Amino acid sequence: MHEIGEHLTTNTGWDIIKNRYEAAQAITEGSNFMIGNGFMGYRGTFAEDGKDAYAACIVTDTWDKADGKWEELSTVPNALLTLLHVDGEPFIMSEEAASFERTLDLSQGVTSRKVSQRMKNGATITIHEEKFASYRKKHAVLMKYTVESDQDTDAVLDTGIDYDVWSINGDHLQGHHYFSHPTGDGVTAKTVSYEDTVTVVETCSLDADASEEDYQNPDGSGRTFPLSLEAGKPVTLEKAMIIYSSNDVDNPQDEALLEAKHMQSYEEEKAANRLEWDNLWSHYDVTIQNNIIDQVALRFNIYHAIIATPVHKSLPIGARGLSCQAYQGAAFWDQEIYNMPMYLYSNPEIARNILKYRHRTLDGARRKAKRLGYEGAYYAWISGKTGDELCPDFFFKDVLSGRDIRNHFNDWQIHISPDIAYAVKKYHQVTGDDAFIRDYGAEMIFEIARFLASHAVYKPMRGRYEFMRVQGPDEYHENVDNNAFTNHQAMFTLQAADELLQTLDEKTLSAVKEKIGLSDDEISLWRDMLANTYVPKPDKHGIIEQFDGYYDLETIIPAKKVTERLIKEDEYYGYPNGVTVRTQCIKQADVIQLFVLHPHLYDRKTVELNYEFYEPRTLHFSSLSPSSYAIVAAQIDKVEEAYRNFRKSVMIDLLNTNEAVSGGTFIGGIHTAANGASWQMVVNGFGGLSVHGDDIHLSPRLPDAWDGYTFKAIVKGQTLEVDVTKEQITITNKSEDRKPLTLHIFGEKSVLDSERITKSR
Amino acid sequence: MHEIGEHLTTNTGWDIIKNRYEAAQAITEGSNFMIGNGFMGYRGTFAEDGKDAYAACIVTDTWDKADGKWEELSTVPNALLTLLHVDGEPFIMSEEAASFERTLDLSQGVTSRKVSQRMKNGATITIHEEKFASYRKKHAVLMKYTVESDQDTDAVLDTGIDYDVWSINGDHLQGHHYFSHPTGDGVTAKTVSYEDTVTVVETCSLDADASEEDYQNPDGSGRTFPLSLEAGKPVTLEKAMIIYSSNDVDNPQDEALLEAKHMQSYEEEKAANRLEWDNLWSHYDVTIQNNIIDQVALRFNIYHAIIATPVHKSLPIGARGLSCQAYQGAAFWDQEIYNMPMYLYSNPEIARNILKYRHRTLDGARRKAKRLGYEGAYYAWISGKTGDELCPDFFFKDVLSGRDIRNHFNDWQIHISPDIAYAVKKYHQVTGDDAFIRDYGAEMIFEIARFLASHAVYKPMRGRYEFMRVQGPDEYHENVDNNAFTNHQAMFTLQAADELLQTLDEKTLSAVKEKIGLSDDEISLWRDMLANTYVPKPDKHGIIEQFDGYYDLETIIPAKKVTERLIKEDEYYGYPNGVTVRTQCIKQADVIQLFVLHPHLYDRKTVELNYEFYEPRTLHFSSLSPSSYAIVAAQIDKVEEAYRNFRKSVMIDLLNTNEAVSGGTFIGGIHTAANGASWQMVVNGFGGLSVHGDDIHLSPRLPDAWDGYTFKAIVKGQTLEVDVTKEQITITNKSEDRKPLTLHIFGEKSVLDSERITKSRLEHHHH
Numbered sequence A: 001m002h003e004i005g006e007h008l009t010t011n012t013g014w015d016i017i018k019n020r021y022e023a024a025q026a027i028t029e030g031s032n033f034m035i036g037n038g039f040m041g042y043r044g045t046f047a048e049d050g051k052d053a054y055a056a057c058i059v060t061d062t063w064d065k066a067d068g069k070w071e072e073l074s075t076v077p078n079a080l081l082t083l084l085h086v087d088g089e090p091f092i093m094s095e096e097a098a099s100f101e102r103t104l105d106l107s108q109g110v111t112s113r114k115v116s117q118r119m120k121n122g123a124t125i126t127i128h129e130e131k132f133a134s135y136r137k138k139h140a141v142l143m144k145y146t147v148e149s150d151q152d153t154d155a156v157l158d159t160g161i162d163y164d165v166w167s168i169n170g171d172h173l174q175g176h177h178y179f180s181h182p183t184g185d186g187v188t189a190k191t192v193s194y195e196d197t198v199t200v201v202e203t204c205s206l207d208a209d210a211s212e213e214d215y216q217n218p219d220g221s222g223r224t225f226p227l228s229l230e231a232g233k234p235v236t237l238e239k240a241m242i243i244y245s246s247n248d249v250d251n252p253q254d255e256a257l258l259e260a261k262h263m264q265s266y267e268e269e270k271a272a273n274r275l276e277w278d279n280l281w282s283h284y285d286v287t288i289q290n291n292i293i294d295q296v297a298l299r300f301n302i303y304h305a306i307i308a309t310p311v312h313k314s315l316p317i318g319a320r321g322l323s324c325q326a327y328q329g330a331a332f333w334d335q336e337i338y339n340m341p342m343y344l345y346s347n348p349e350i351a352r353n354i355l356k357y358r359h360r361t362l363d364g365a366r367r368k369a370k371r372l373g374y375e376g377a378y379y380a381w382i383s384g385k386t387g388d389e390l391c392p393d394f395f396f397k398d399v400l401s402g403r404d405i406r407n408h409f410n411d412w413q414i415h416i417s418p419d420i421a422y423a424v425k426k427y428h429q430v431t432g433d434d435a436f437i438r439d440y441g442a443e444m445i446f447e448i449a450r451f452l453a454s455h456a457v458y459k460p461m462r463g464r465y466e467f468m469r470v471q472g473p474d475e476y477h478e479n480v481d482n483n484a485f486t487n488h489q490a491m492f493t494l495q496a497a498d499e500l501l502q503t504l505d506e507k508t509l510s511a512v513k514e515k516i517g518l519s520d521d522e523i524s525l526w527r528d529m530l531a532n533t534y535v536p537k538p539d540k541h542g543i544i545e546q547f548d549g550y551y552d553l554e555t556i557i558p559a560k561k562v563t564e565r566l567i568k569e570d571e572y573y574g575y576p577n578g579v580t581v582r583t584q585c586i587k588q589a590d591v592i593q594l595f596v597l598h599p600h601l602y603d604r605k606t607v608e609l610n611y612e613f614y615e616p617r618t619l620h621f622s623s624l625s626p627s628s629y630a631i632v633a634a635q636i637d638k639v640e641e642a643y644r645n646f647r648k649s650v651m652i653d654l655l656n657t658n659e660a661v662s663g664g665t666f667i668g669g670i671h672t673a674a675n676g677a678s679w680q681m682v683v684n685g686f687g688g689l690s691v692h693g694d695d696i697h698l699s700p701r702l703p704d705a706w707d708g709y710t711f712k713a714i715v716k717g718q719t720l721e722v723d724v725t726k727e728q729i730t731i732t733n734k735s736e737d738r739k740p741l742t743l744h745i746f747g748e749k750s751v752l753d754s755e756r757i758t759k760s761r
Numbered sequence B: 001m002h003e004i005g006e007h008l009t010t011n012t013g014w015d016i017i018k019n020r021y022e023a024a025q026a027i028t029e030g031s032n033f034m035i036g037n038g039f040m041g042y043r044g045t046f047a048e049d050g051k052d053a054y055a056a057c058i059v060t061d062t063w064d065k066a067d068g069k070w071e072e073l074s075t076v077p078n079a080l081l082t083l084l085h086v087d088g089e090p091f092i093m094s095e096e097a098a099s100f101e102r103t104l105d106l107s108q109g110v111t112s113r114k115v116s117q118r119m120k121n122g123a124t125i126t127i128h129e130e131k132f133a134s135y136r137k138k139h140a141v142l143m144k145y146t147v148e149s150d151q152d153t154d155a156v157l158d159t160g161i162d163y164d165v166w167s168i169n170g171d172h173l174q175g176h177h178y179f180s181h182p183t184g185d186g187v188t189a190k191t192v193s194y195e196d197t198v199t200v201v202e203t204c205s206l207d208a209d210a211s212e213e214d215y216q217n218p219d220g221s222g223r224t225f226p227l228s229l230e231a232g233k234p235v236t237l238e239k240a241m242i243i244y245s246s247n248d249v250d251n252p253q254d255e256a257l258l259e260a261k262h263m264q265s266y267e268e269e270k271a272a273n274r275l276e277w278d279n280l281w282s283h284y285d286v287t288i289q290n291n292i293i294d295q296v297a298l299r300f301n302i303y304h305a306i307i308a309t310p311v312h313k314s315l316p317i318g319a320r321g322l323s324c325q326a327y328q329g330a331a332f333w334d335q336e337i338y339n340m341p342m343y344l345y346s347n348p349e350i351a352r353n354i355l356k357y358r359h360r361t362l363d364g365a366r367r368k369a370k371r372l373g374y375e376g377a378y379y380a381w382i383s384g385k386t387g388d389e390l391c392p393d394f395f396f397k398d399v400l401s402g403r404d405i406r407n408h409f410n411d412w413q414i415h416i417s418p419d420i421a422y423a424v425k426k427y428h429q430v431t432g433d434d435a436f437i438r439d440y441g442a443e444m445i446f447e448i449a450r451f452l453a454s455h456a457v458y459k460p461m462r463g464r465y466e467f468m469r470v471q472g473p474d475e476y477h478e479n480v481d482n483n484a485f486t487n488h489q490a491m492f493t494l495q496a497a498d499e500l501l502q503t504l505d506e507k508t509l510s511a512v513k514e515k516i517g518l519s520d521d522e523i524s525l526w527r528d529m530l531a532n533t534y535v536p537k538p539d540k541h542g543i544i545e546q547f548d549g550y551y552d553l554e555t556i557i558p559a560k561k562v563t564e565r566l567i568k569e570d571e572y573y574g575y576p577n578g579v580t581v582r583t584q585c586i587k588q589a590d591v592i593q594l595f596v597l598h599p600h601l602y603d604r605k606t607v608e609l610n611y612e613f614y615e616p617r618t619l620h621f622s623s624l625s626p627s628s629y630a631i632v633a634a635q636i637d638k639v640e641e642a643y644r645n646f647r648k649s650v651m652i653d654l655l656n657t658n659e660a661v662s663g664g665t666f667i668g669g670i671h672t673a674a675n676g677a678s679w680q681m682v683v684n685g686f687g688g689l690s691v692h693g694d695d696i697h698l699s700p701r702l703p704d705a706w707d708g709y710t711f712k713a714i715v716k717g718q719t720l721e722v723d724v725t726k727e728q729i730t731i732t733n734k735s736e737d738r739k740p741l742t743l744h745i746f747g748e749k750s751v752l753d754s755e756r757i758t759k760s761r762l763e764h765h766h767h
């Protein structure tokens, strides 16, 4: 049908259309309408755009630390740059264009613009441009650009490679060397810190015959074509931009030249990309019946998750994906807790490879732990190629003094480690993949249990272990003790480790133990900690205290009342002396995050009482927060409140609602964790899907705004399809080697055999 | 035999004189030139001064928390206010007066002014005024004020009780009620928080036969005497100001009036004060030969220490004494570590009472530990009447933002508890007072050991205990782990508790264990801690790390270069994001403080390497710091370096060298810990005096600036006097005379069984 928001609509449920150009909203648009394929992201700019419009092509595995502090992915030369003059006048976007639309077609990752603007000579010029990053040939991004005049006119088209690109924390590439090949130009350059080679090759094909002249200068190269446009006769340019680095392959320039030489036409490459995207959507599409706005917003988020996910090499999903350099193209706990579940239940080999990325980087976690005085694996807060910590000590500034502030994201926020062990165990429960636990997952869980045993303190007069001096998911409170989320998660790891010691076969167990030198003394300490570690529990009013002493901080309800205490609008809110430090205002889900990860650990009334206590004290100043409260709301029958938090979460980028800057650091770009959680809110939230042992739970609720929804979930290799209407719930076991399962729908057991099982409200 | 600084001089080494009036120096001058007697402090203002000149009389045991945050002593109505007009023109000090001096006579606590100023009618008026707080009648402060003109003239003298007095954190008295008595006026008021009664009584005698009209307003009472002054004929006014509270007596108004009734003349009261002061100087005086500036600065310091010390009731010595309300008139670790030693060696009953004050307040320490989730005794950082914590959570503000900052003086600076255990053990070593350990000290040491055991964490993969998230004596670095000073002091306390459990007789030991419920399981934890607690040790270069990760912070030498980073000059330098937080610059001695308390803990080379490493990293922003470096330096025969820090320390108040405002909070007033430390630097630092049961040790060093020094000590009831010069040392025993006295002078034993021993002394500058 209709209207999403600003001036955005959908016509099909698969497309987002913006029909007014406004330069204020251009750029937010560069993120939202971007294209990509897990190897690169190419911002949704128009072919004339460069550094002033924040154009960028961000490429995986090109980390560089040129400014001496921020290691982030490189932005590379732009081989799609294309500039039009019409009788001398440059074509420049105006808000008064006779006609403007930009469209992102989510069914195939094709982004485009159609614009008509009358020029000073009277000619009305129409440009249609479309671009996509090939999911078939992941090193290539392709464009078709067509210009048409309604009136005979001369014009000039320049096209080439722009070296002078936007980069947030210093230019990452130096030493640019021009070269030519039969279909265009190329540039090879080297990164600043590691001196890796990056090559961009441009191919260019123009359908009109015209004298053409090349140019090469220190800021780019290219060629110019004078055109005689005839009334109503369009001229089409097709370009490919191909990128390889020495981290992808041995002699990248050679390789980029071969990929260029064998590239097929724009249309042939477009059809092959469409076939790959049909296959992606067959895994991940979730349908929503009779709410096309919600339907398209969900597809927008899943689309953004997919294009942020590297599948060509063992690499992290960035917390802003490849939409820009913010958050360093690197993995945070968002990767396992927010992004992995869609993959776990829809295409588990992708989840396995996420976890294998954490295995591959376990040495970085071992070195981090040792550097900080611990043992085991303390995973990096911000993980890039090797697993060494990329998060600086001074992430932010105190904007009131101009001084760096020391936030302990990188060394007190320890929950990253047991979050990884949790994800290992979840992946094992859902898939039944024993071999993963034998070869990789058991070693991971035990090194994480060893780390937690080395961080913990024992308090002999209280007879208990405690986790002191931490930062929990609510990052604004640092230096807290016995954060409830972290304590519980630590106990779930130790419990998983204890289970493996009792359950693995003796040969696998001996091998893992000898590999990581695990002693009987440590195993005894883990079992002592399982029996005596303090875990925050519900008080006489049902409330789980967020960390020790949180109840004595100042109650401010609702939490945004604290924003009245700001002196400058862009002050960091948290430690050491931000406005929230001695208040109960929290950045995001912390106790409520516990219930998302462990939905049946506490009973529905305890979860409700904690929801009703913490929601009004949460700022939701991380994109991670609204979806956690949506998922918990859906399952204590606060469905309409869940729906509202669903909308907050699915619309964060589309309708632009979160802070670009905080404490002097750029925080903006696409919110990849929120993209992942879109799927979770429907399937784990409204659907109530969770897996305990052999036990599959479903509890499907239905927002009043929808007439139904449907999703697939793969549990123990069985592909199930769950369809929810007003009246009923249908579960179909699709699949060749089909086995019996056993459900729990709204708390009743009902052994599934073979395609029947309809039940009601 | 004259210049100290500014326009400050001494004539005899017993007096300090300032011969220029500077209105900007009033806060400093009124502290330095004050009078007092341990019961009150009366700032050294002149008789016409009030709120604008920071006049104050600060009275012990009148704590009030009117503003809801700072509990501080009350400033009370001023019964010495005296204003002169000459032919209708008010007498106002001019910075260009014909003649001016103020004098503090340290021999007897008398502070005075003589001033001559020419008035508009041409008369030159001379005022001579002196005041003292009686050490004989501790509730009385007296004044004699004399005016004379070289020209016949009308004058008016208005004298009375000013109620409108300066108070730092809000007015503390309300309900002021005027009354009269045969020799003047009085006022009775009540404190805001606790509704305690305070009465001030004024007595007033004028030796001119002129008549008087009285006035009573809401801001004060008094009377005006219109005079006809005769050229060359002085007029004298004598007053007493008497103060009682209902924390001192049941009926303070009656007692103040009974005191008034039995007052003698100004001159008789002054003579009785003189006698008390002769007795005090006979215990505490330390003389220095041929350096009259160091001699007077030493007596000025000792004097301030004496008048800050309450001897009339069980009360703390305040960290700014009674010089003003700053630091809450309350005890800090300063009291045991800085002020106690002169008393310990010179008049040990006073040290015993300092420790009994800490025993009396053990319940406030136990409530503080419980409130913070610990057990045993976590003493208050700032202790007043009860021992409950007086230090606010929000001591300072971030002056860049105006917001409060949370510093953890009151809940992470845990060394206060083992500092008190240390002072209990030191007191016992010096005095052999077993009875104190039976009745009081073993209970204190065990509750402090129980607290430390409750604070520590055990690291099972490291196999050891550690003390995490503390703040050491260097207050600027908070949230540090294994501060060396703290970890060693904790192990000394557990060692002392362990020694008592293994040594005390079964009767005394059962009574204490039963009183505090000390369990065998607790004892086994202390003994496990003794065997397995991490204690920072010297590294391959001999240096003990101040806390974990200190060596990774930024080196700035000289440390003062760090103040170039300041954005406002009065910012707090420390936590959470002050300019020193991520640097090696330290507020005050911290590793070096450990060697002050434990001079043989490590060999001389190790102490020297740490001194050389840390002294250039020290800002000495705190007045506690230079004396610690002087003592450590003197103990390792770095005599001239010890003398450089001695000179810095003794002049801190006299030359106004330290900051008065920080982080938006007033921290000025007289620096009582530094005043107490003056005596230790000479006697324990240069003298090397220490006393361990029967053995008395001296290791007398002599700075090149002095030709000798002498001091007294009272060891197991024998009064010893020691005279050190470059070429010899004499020791006399001047008492009732029990022969058993054993002395070690450097390595050599003497039995002091005659009345005088004389030994030659060699130079002990280290080569």
Ligand SMILES: OC[C@H]1O[C@@H](O)[C@H](O)[C@@H](O)[C@@H]1O
Pocket (backbone or CB within 6 Å): A319, A327, A332, A333, A334, A473, A475, A587, A588, A621, A622, A624, A673
């Ligand atoms: O998305 C990366 C990070 O963004 C932050 O603002 C959130 O507080 C973190 O929980 C999250 O991991």
Ligand SMILES: OC[C@H]1O[C@@H](O)[C@H](O)[C@@H](O)[C@@H]1O
Pocket (backbone or CB within 6 Å): B319, B327, B332, B333, B334, B473, B475, B587, B588, B622, B624, B673
């Ligand atoms: O004198 C009272 C307090 O003053 C502070 O400035 C010092 O850093 C403390 O060590 C001292 O205890």
Ligand SMILES: [Ca+2]
Pocket (backbone or CB within 6 Å): A264, A265, A268
């Ligand atoms: Ca072809």
Ligand SMILES: [Ca+2]
Pocket (backbone or CB within 6 Å): A608, A612
């Ligand atoms: Ca409710």
